[PDB]
């Protein structure tokens, strides 16, 4: 099963929204947010 890169984040839960899939969505979204904000928290923007 080759890698597929997972199109737009809510891709899964738009087909048969379940508890586990919704928890997964929340988790990955907040992980991305946390990483980006930490990188900008300490360093800042290019200018």
């Amino acid at each position: 099963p080759p890698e597929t890169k997972l199109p737009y984040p809510t891709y899964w839960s738009d087909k048969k929204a379940d508890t586990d899939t919704l928890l997964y969505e929340q988790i990955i979204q907040r992980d991305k947010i946390n990483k980006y904000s930490l990188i900008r928290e300490t360093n800042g923007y290019d200018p």
Partner: peptide
């Protein structure tokens, strides 16, 4: 076949309140 597992993010605290106050306190 092998399963691909994504493990969520667990982090330890880096700064105290957005800053590290030990270095700031030295320079201050």
């Amino acid at each position: 076949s092998i399963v691909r597992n994504y493990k969520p993010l667990i982090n330890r605290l880096k700064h105290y309140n957005g800053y590290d106050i030990n270095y700031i306190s030295k320079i201050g």
